Amino acid sequence: IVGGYTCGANTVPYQVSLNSGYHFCGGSLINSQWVVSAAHCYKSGIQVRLGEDNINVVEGNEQFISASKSIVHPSYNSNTLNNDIMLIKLKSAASLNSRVASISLPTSCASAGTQCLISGWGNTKSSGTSYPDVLKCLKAPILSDSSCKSASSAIITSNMFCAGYLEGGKDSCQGDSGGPVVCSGKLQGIVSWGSGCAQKNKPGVYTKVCNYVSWIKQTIASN
Ligand SMILES: [Ca+2]
């Protein structure tokens, strides 16, 4: 997260860290046994880390659970990142408490102007590299599609939405991928991609979760 703030230990209880020997992506707990993340975050042998704040210090509220099954969206396109969403089932149910809670799926899509909360342990520099050990937060509004499309050299589909700032300085970044974008108490997006980080004329692009609720519910009910 670039231009954000320190969230506060466990203030984003649904936020998870995907670990394969180190943190590589974020995710969201949607129920005691399932996590939603980005398909481009797929990796073999994933361990999900819950109740985390500082990812390099055992603080006392963590739960480390290995994935039993990973399900990348059937139509994921690695060249355009269309349908960049993936489901991960945990080997055992997470223990839900005040520091580990699930986030609700949307009943309808959110509109431009709506403020959302984006979080992650990604790079905090638009230029250079600096990875935080504690969770960073950023409040950002959903923008009209044209806001991202105007200066984009890549395809932006109806399965993606634009969020962030046009004058740069604030944005999600590498390492934040797969993380949540929560608006009005609902998981509306997944950190997917962008052109650099916090660059002018180029806000972030996120997977539009509201388009995948049916697939998510059917898959969870059948696995
Ligand atoms: Ca920790």
134 CA → ligand 1 middle, Å: 9
Which amino acid does the sequence have at 81?
A: L
At residue 39, the 3 state secondary structure works out as helix
Q: Is 52 annotated as a binding residue?
A: yes
Which amino acid does the sequence have at 196?
A: G
Residue corresponding to tokens 């704040």? 53
DSSP-derived pairing of the beta strands 136-143 and 5-6: antiparallel
Among 136, 152, 32, 16, smallest CA distance to 92 is for: 32
Both tokens assigned to 56: 């390099």
Cβ–Cβ < 8 Å for 90, 36: no
Q: What angle do CA 184, 103, 219 make, to 5 degrees?
A: 120
The HSE-up count of residue 173 (CA atoms within 13 Å, CB side) is: 27
Both tokens assigned to 80: 């355009």
Q: How many other β-carbons are positioned within 10 Å of the β-carbon of residue 56? A: 10
Residue corresponding to tokens 């600096």? 130
The HSE-up count of residue 6 (CA atoms within 13 Å, CB side) is: 8
Residue corresponding to tokens 């899509």? 109
For domain 13-102+211-223, the CATH architecture is Beta Barrel (2.40)
For domain 1-12+103-210, the CATH architecture is Beta Barrel (2.40)
Residue extents of the structural domains in the chain: 1-12+103-210, 13-102+211-223
Cα 176 to Cα 1, 75, 141, 157: the distances in Å are: 7, 22, 17, 21
Among 13, 35, 17, 39, smallest CA distance to 26 is for: 17
Q: Is 168 annotated as a binding residue?
A: no
170 CA → ligand 1 middle, Å: 26
